[PDB]
Amino acid sequence: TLGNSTINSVVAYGRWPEYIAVAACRFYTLDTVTWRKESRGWWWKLPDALKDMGLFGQNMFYHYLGRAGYTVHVQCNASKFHQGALGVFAVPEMCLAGDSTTHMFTKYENANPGEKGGEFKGSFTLDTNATNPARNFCPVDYLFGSGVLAGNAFVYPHQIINLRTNNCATLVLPYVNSLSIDSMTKHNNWGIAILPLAPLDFATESSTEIPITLTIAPMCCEFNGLRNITVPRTQ
Amino acid sequence: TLGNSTINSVVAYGRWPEYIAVAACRFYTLDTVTWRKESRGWWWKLPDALKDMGLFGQNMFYHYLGRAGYTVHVQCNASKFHQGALGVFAVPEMCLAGDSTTHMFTKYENANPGEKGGEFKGSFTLDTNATNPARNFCPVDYLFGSGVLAGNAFVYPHQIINLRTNNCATLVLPYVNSLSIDSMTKHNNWGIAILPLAPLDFATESSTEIPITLTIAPMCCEFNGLRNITVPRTQ
Amino acid sequence: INDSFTEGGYISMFYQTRVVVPLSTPRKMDILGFVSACNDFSVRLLRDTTHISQE
Amino acid sequence: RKNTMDMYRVELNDAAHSDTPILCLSLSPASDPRLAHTMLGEILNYYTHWAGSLKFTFL
Amino acid sequence: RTRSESTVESFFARGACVAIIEVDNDAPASKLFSIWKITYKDTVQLRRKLEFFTYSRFDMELTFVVTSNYTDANNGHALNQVYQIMYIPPGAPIPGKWNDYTWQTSSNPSLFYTYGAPPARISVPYVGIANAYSHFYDGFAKVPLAGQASGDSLYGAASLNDFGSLAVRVVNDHNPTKLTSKIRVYMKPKHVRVWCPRPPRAVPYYGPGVDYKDGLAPLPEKGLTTY
Amino acid sequence: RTRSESTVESFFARGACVAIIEVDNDAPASKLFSIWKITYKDTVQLRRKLEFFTYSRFDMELTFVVTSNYTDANNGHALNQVYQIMYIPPGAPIPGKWNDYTWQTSSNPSLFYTYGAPPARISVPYVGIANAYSHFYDGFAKVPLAGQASGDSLYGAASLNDFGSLAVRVVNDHNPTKLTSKIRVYMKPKHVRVWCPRPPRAVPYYGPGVDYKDGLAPLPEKGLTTY
Ligand SMILES: CCCCCCCCCCCCC/C=C/[C@H](O)[C@H](N)CO
Ligand SMILES: CCCCCCCCCCCCC/C=C/[C@H](O)[C@H](N)CO
Numbered sequence A, B: 001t002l003g004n005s006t007i008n009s010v011v012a013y014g015r016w017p018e019y020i021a022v023a024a025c026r027f028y029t030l031d032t033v034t035w036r037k038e039s040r041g042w043w044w045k046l047p048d049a050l051k052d053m054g055l056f057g058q059n060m061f062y063h064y065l066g067r068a069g070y071t072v073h074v075q076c077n078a079s080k081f082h083q084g085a086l087g088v089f090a091v092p093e094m095c096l097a098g099d100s101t102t103h104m105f106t107k108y109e110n111a112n113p114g115e116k117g118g119e120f121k122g123s124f125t126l127d128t129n130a131t132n133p134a135r136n137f138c139p140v141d142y143l144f145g146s147g148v149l150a151g152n153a154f155v156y157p158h159q160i161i162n163l164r165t166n167n168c169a170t171l172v173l174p175y176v177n178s179l180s181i182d183s184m185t186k187h188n189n190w191g192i193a194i195l196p197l198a199p200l201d202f203a204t205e206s207s208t209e210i211p212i213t214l215t216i217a218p219m220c221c222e223f224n225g226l227r228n229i230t231v232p233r234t235q
Numbered sequence C: 001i002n003d004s005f006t007e008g009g010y011i012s013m014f015y016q017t018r019v020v021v022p023l024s025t026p027r028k029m030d031i032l033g034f035v036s037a038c039n040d041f042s043v044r045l046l047r048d049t050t051h052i053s054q055e
Numbered sequence D: 001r002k003n004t005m006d007m008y009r010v011e012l013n014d015a016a017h018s019d020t021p022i023l024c025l026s027l028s029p030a031s032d033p034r035l036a037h038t039m040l041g042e043i044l045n046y047y048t049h050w051a052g053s054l055k056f057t058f059l
Numbered sequence E, F: 001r002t003r004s005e006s007t008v009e010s011f012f013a014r015g016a017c018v019a020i021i022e023v024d025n026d027a028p029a030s031k032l033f034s035i036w037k038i039t040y041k042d043t044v045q046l047r048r049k050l051e052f053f054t055y056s057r058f059d060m061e062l063t064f065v066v067t068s069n070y071t072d073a074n075n076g077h078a079l080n081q082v083y084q085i086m087y088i089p090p091g092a093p094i095p096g097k098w099n100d101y102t103w104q105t106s107s108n109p110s111l112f113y114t115y116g117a118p119p120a121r122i123s124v125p126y127v128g129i130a131n132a133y134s135h136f137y138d139g140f141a142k143v144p145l146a147g148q149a150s151g152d153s154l155y156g157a158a159s160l161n162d163f164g165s166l167a168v169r170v171v172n173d174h175n176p177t178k179l180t181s182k183i184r185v186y187m188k189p190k191h192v193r194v195w196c197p198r199p200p201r202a203v204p205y206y207g208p209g210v211d212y213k214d215g216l217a218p219l220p221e222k223g224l225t226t227y
Helices: A054-061 A150-154 B054-062 B150-155 D039-044 E045-050 F045-050
Strands: A009-011 A033-035 A041-048 A061-076 A082-093 A158-161 A167-174 A190-202 A210-226 B007-013 B034-035 B042-046 B065-077 B082-094 B158-162 B168-173 B190-202 B210-226 C010-013 C028-031 C031-036 C042-044 D010-013 D022-027 D049-051 D054-058 E018-027 E033-037 E053-072 E082-088 E110-114 E120-124 E165-170 E177-195 F016-025 F032-038 F052-069 F082-088 F110-114 F122-125 F165-170 F179-197
Touching: A041 A210, A054 A061, A054 A210, A054 B054, A061 A082, A061 E165, A082 A150, A082 A167, A082 F179, A158 A167, A190 A210, B042 E120, B054 B065, B054 B210, B065 B082, B065 B190, B082 B168, B158 B168, B158 E082, B190 B210, C010 C031, C031 D039, C031 F052, E018 E033, E018 E045, E018 E165, E053 E110, E082 E177, E082 F052, E110 E120, E165 E177, F016 F045, F016 F165, F052 F110, F082 F179, F110 F122, F165 F179
Parallel strands: A009 A167, B007 B168
Antiparallel strands: A033 A210, A041 A190, A061 A167, A061 A210, A082 A158, A082 A190, B034 B210, B042 B190, B065 B168, B065 B210, B082 B158, B082 B190, C010 D022, C028 D010, C031 D054, C042 D049, E018 E177, E033 E165, E053 E120, E053 E177, E082 E110, E082 E165, F016 F179, F032 F165, F052 F122, F052 F179, F082 F110, F082 F165
């Protein structure tokens, strides 16, 4: 229980979140995504995904500096006759490859999608529109979206949701950064990547879909540098 | 100094504010009003006047229950060749008379004007428009807007700004209520009334105007009952 | 009684995930609700009820 | 459903996820018609003032 | 010289008339029972005394003075009447007829008064749902929300001063002759505590709020240099 | 916050009307005396409160409120009436006439009330032949035996709630003018103990048992997803 919100667990690097506001930092439920047979994966950025969550987003945009750990709870239930496996990875500094011949050309509005996040692709497509480039991420699942083999992503803090065994995953991420505190609007400290390690299947049904829900609670929150409100440009 | 905000004093009823959030509760400057020779007076309601002030307004509208004391600082400077006197009164449960033959007909949007507040009138005018009634306050200055003689308003916590002596007033208002904590959107705990006790004058000028500025810091703030955001109807 | 000044709040139920069943299983089911008071509950000012009347 | 046994049952199904509420209740234990005639509500309707926490169990 | 008679207790230690409830004893233009909502704002003297302050706590003593008379001369005689005064707290069923079941008063407190007896009297403790009574409430019961049509509650009206009503009837079956009765209610606060003094009312009261309509020029004329 | 007012004692600490006994003072269409069998099931409020439980023990306080009136206008005057209320325990002889010998009340408790006096009042202890009163009895007084013709006792009826009756008359010799009087009986249980809570009555009472006939659809309509 954290605040008025209530409900194996993995503590990233064995380090519980710690201090170097209090009401605002509680469990928030993002929009549900649909796991299909042909799904490739999903990603979110923290604190970006929580930027429109009650008082936590207000504190994000009213302060120059902020820091927080997180507790991420992935929820996905199915029957005993379903099969499939998900890998949930927490990546510090989760930089994703772009889609253009120009290096680092992804624009701010696409790098910070919010609680909807983005999806991995099965292959790499190069954006050719030069007059109006998309300037979006093109994260390939087997390259883990950053030019590394997804099979080695298990070096990151992670959990596995095997449908025959468990239906939930819990990751406790401490604040990780080269600084004690940073700008929450400039920098995403954590990334969450969910990849289907084993494809979803249900007997004699090429139609089954099951929901995945993420609930994220910021922890050990600190804010500093109160000023007027930041209003980032949107697309 | 309260927070990042910095800068005789009267403690209302000799009781300093006390507890039964922390960053949000700081000095906020309302819009300046213009003291003229023909001015009749000004009024504001607390916490209504601070409802759009940074994080304090957000905490007001995100919680069911809130309480706070206040520190009110009235600022008004002039030359040694100006004359005039202001009375600044802090009134608990400052109910103001309406403008219609219907009792208690003043609508919520007019009873809660915000940081602009309202002005006293010199005489009572009865609103006659029946198809579209105004449903606004009609506070008469010498009746102190509530059917009592303004000369006795000095039984309330108050300060006097005499232009020949001082240019500022400071009132420390503790939280006053029949309850330990209440709804900040339903109920105004305090009212501030500023009346010209002696009219403003400047030698051989029937044009002089001087500004009055209010800076209000909530103190000993408490909030409880976090839920979705309250969005009051506006007019 | 129903009074705005002493309103209590709202209780709501939602799907966090959906309900999933295998084949050869009922797809519709029922939930039941129960309510009680906790040990800190108290009442005051005994009065007559509106739930019984005589004709 | 009112005045039968079906008034005690709330139906769930296995349809796709949605954000629509399953049930909505006002926390008015003596005046909300769904809580007024429970044992708690019946006791409350013999009194004028109430205070304290409530417990909702779902089966 | 002590200040014993100016203590808050002594200032309010008087029975003040707050209501005249009228009932009739007649065969069923008449009113065989009357409902009076309990308040001190129907009269002025006690209201003005109380509104010297913002908040108060006290127990209340109610005294009932009952008078009655025939309506017609030499129309006949009547046997001594009995009156029922039933307290109906907010939420309890309200009588709709002289003989309805609600008068059984199984849970409502009730008082039976015999005419010619000394005025009836009961006491009640401080019954406020808040920690004190509010003589003034600067707020609304409902906040109107965006999306709502044209939360329209009256200014200052709150259920923190809702104390129920008194239902008054004559218990006797109706005489052949018409009788009229008046019950005068006298309030006395006891064990009084008060907070936040206010300037006293200067113009005539207009409604349960602080609104004013008439008599706005109270003070007379007096020369500045005249003793 | 204590629970002092929700104790079983406080819940029942009220005088509830259970009967209106009507008598006449007239020369011998009239009823010069009335018999009322003692029960709380003629009214609903106290009955519903008591039937929250299966068993109970308590002492009883009875209060009698007496009202009277002339029947005709200017028909004449009357002297103050005296009323006799005689308790007739089961088995005692029952009056058959206004003037029969039974009113001598050598062994029956009796109460003489003067009109205009404060309501009469007596107290009785727990008088049940069993260890507690039964609000519900799931059985018969007689078991019908094979060989018996078509032991036919009513369901639920037992002598464990037989407490006798009250016989009420006007002691005065009859006036030249007709007078009508009503005696209202108010019960207050005291020193109450209760056992085996039951769900409260939800539909109108029908007879002294648990039978129901009408008003079987009490609950209103309310949308599932509407606050
Ligand atoms: C059984 C005969 C009737 C006796 C019961 C009388 C009613 C009970 C008292 C209810 C009224 C509470 C006292 C009222 C206090 C004032 O109205 C407050 N100062 C309002 O601000
Ligand atoms: C002399 C004047 C009359 C005074 C005597 C009054 C009658 C004596 C009391 C008899 C009634 C016993 C009390 C009744 C208890 C309830 O009926 C039980 N709860 C039944 O279940």
